[PDB]
Amino acid sequence: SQPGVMYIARLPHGFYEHELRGYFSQFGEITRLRVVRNKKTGASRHRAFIEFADAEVADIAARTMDKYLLFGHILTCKIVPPAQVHPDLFKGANRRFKVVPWNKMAGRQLERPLSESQWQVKVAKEEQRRAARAEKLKEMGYEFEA
Amino acid sequence: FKRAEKYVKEYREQEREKIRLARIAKQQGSFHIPAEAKLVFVIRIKGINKIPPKPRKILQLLRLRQINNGVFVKVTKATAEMIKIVEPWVAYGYPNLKSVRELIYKRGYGKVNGQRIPLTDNAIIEENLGKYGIICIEDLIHEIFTVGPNFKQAANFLWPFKLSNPNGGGNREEHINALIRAMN
Amino acid sequence: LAAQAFKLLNKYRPETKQEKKERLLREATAIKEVSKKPYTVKYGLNHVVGLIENKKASLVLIANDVDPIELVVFLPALCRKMGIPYAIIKGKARLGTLVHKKTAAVVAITEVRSEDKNELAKLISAVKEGYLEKVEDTRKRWGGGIMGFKAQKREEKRKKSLETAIK
Amino acid sequence: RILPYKPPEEREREEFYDLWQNEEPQPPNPMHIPAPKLPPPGYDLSYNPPPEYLPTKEEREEWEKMDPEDREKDYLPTKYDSLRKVPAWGNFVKERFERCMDLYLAPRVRKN
Amino acid sequence: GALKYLEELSKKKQSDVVRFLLRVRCWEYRQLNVIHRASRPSRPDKARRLGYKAKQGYVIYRVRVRRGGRQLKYQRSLRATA
Amino acid sequence: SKAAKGAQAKKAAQAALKGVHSSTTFHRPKTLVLSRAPKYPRKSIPH
Amino acid sequence: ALEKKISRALGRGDVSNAARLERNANLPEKTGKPRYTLNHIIRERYPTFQDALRDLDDCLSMLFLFANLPSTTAVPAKMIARCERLCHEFQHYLIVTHSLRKSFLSIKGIYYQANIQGEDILWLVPYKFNQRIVGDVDFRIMGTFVEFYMTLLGFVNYRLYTSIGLKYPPKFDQVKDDQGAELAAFSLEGLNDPSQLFANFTFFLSRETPRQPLEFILRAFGCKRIGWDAVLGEGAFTTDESDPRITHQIIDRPGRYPGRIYVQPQWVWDSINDEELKPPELYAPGAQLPPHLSP
RNA sequence: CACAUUGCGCCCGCCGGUAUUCCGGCGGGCAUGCCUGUUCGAGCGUCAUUUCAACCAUCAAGCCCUGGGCUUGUGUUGGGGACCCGCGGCUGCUCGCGGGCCCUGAAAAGCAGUGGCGGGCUCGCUGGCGGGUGCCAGCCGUAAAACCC
């Protein structure tokens, strides 16, 4: 009962969750699998972690697919030793990393009205900010009114 | 045994298929065809292995399930939509009278009780059709050429044409006619 | 790696004899009624050795099955000394099919077009790492010694017949 | 001395005699046993024959029942009102294939 | 340059590579006939400097010759007998 | 269990590296025998 | 040997050389002409045009059958196309020379008998349907038969046109064949009792009629003007059925013009059998057809 | 082939005798070693062979003040840098959205966080209903809809 963790790097565009699972499950049995992705935009950092049930199987997989040329990409498949496998490494394993249109969200947010009494205490805050802008603008020498 | 090479290949193929399907959905009616009531012959040819769900449904509806199979379809606007959706897997064009004669007389069949009986007798022709005034196989040819009121049930009678592989031979217009001499 | 090699290489394959005659007839007819330098896969043992010695070769592929072997037995060492990336390919008939001959003992890539500079560089990096590192690990040692069950049993028979009592 | 170069499309677009020219009679070799012509059509092939040739429904059932390739005579006359009803013969290609096989496999012996 | 590389490799005969190759070939030639045809020169550089070309008309024959003497010594060599 | 896993992994690695593709007495086979088709008659006129 | 070397080239990747070698191989799959030249075997098998006309029975039977049959591997589509050109060409020779004599309708098809240079020549045409092929019928053998007979009719029709004075090959319009001319696509140029039976008559063919049988019969026995529906094919003298200058027309259905004669196709066949016009009242539609007699 | 007897064999063709079967005669051929080239082969001698291709508008449609112009079509590898800003929240620190500048081979070592709808899986209650589910190579952006059937 010694699970083995392999790190794959230099991932070609498209060799994602499902292709990785199929390929390395055709090699063996995967406990968990996760490509790392960006929260702001649903794009991968071109690297992934696969925890196999069998450390030996993971070792042969790493040896056979370490220096592979796939779509102009030399892969990097290396077993990480069980000493530095961080306990909270497979946190988003096996789930779905969804793409969140944060820009549209902020935009719908800018269009949703509200009682702007709080936005008027906020315009008191922006009057103090343009006072800050004016005090940094005194070295410039530009005077502007409200 | 399957390779990561393949896995990535089909991944990008389905990615492009999704992109193109959204584009039509956004630009519903992209195919700039003038409004003419004509006939289109469509042949399913080998393409991408994993067909997306809506193209699979359209192919099942058009009965182009197996490879290298041709059917006749009335050119309506929904027809154009589905044909240009399923464009990657099919070759489509405008038939000719000699061509339809050859297909119906050499490779013509009919669907009876879910069984394929070769078009061997006008008696079977009045047995299946005829209630709408289709008396003979060349009456069927006539309606197919000059599409009439009963094209839907006519095509339902015609079981899709199983062609032969091309022996040394989008919208192909009259060139699909050369294709179907090459495949027939 | 062999497949990738032959993909960049198949683009730089030599002109067949029919194609060369057809081209020559084309310029002859043009003169009857101004080109860039051709780039191709350089083959021939002496020619490739000269290119390696003059450091014009960017990549070298050596067939594994040349008999006599002495023709190539120094080529990996020469390539390592000159610093050119080299690899060993299974099949002198296959290196031979890139050129239009029956057998090529060696083929080399000197220069490629701008459309393939990046591809050639990536192939060089990939072959260098994924083959030369393993070869550096195990190239300096002796080969052979694959004795099977019958061979080892004969070995114990020989020893138990030799060192027991008499010589 | 040599043809000028031609573009491949022009080459693609670019690319009989009286066989009895010197004809003389020859003696027929006695080893030649030619194939006799097929028997001429009878009065039973007609799709609209005289009613005397119309056979019985019971023998028709027996003919359709007993297995193929055992008759004296390989069809039965049938009356049809018109070519609309006249159907395509289903064993035509089979019969002509058997005739060809008779050409290239049936032994030929002259008999008196 | 392969011809000089082969010339030096043939100069160094008791070197390990040449000794191994000569052993295997010596076995192969003993299994083969006393006089037989060669295909390709096993020493292409020597054949070329002696005048061999790869033309239709040049052939190689390998011959085995028994070594030793007749205390009488044969005035012709084993090379001339071959 | 462990042996099966090792064997399947080795088979997969072999397939990845090398692909999926990998009476008793002997007589002289009967080969094709050409009849003589000479380019010139040996003797111009028969005796 | 050439096939082996083409396989060598294909396995070696030299696609251009392989393609050159396949033109040198002269593949029927593209050429449509037979694999080997057969002029000498024709010469030594058939010593005379009389024997050629005597075996024209079987020659025409096979080439008609494979001009009707679908395309297969042994006999490709363009080989069938050449068969169709040559069979319609021989039909032109018969039409022009009025050499056709008798016709016959049977449950086995349509028999045609002609007399060329005193030789009686027969051939059977299957009905225009999907000839259903059953069992171990390997198409290589009668494909070889087809090649043999294609060479035979090529030479026979060449000789026949050289004898009549017409040129070989006839001018054939691919475009008109595309618009469906069949027999109407050939314009026969030259070199620089039978024809009276329907000569003074004009005919029309409906959608239900056997197009090329009726057309061949009437062309062979004189009728110079038939109209037919556009779906039937190009070459119709009058496509409109409402055209008034019509004497006879074939109806085979279960505007009723006064100046008009509706006849069944059996009228045309028994007319060509009996050399005399049969009663249109006794062969009118909706009546029990008088018995057909073998010729 | 044969001490060579004017004898005896195999392939092709012809002639004369009742001749498609018999007899006899005639003509052209059938030695070995080796070279070049053909064609047919044999080898648990070697090798390749489950295919990493192209495939958006090389222009269209709608328009305006009639001849030029406009709108549309929406398509981007990732990471890093006490650098310069705008706007939304945060008591505030700060964090997001968008920019400006620089660097890196198609480079790489946890940092994964936004609420939902369909559908899958699963547990209970009386096929139906209520719950969950780091499950969806489906959508969506507060609710919810569409595909779905």
UniProtKB/Swiss-Prot annotation, chain D:
Q: Which residues of the full protein are shown?
A: 302 to 419 of 801
Annotated region (Disordered) at 51-70
How does this chain assemble? Component of the NOP7 complex, composed of ERB1, NOP7 and YTM1. The complex is held together by ERB1, which interacts with NOP7 via its N-terminal domain and with YTM1 via a high-affinity interaction between the seven-bladed beta-propeller domains of the 2 proteins. The NOP7 complex associates with the 66S pre-ribosome.
Q: What is this protein called?
A: Ribosome biogenesis protein ERB1
Which compartment or compartments is the protein found in? Nucleus, Nucleolus; Nucleus, Nucleoplasm
The biased composition feature labelled Basic and acidic residues covers 55-70
Q: Where would one find the signal peptide in this protein?
A: none
Q: What does this protein do?
A: Component of the NOP7 complex, which is required for maturation of the 25S and 5.8S ribosomal RNAs and formation of the 60S ribosome.
Q: Which family does it belong to?
A: Belongs to the WD repeat BOP1/ERB1 family.
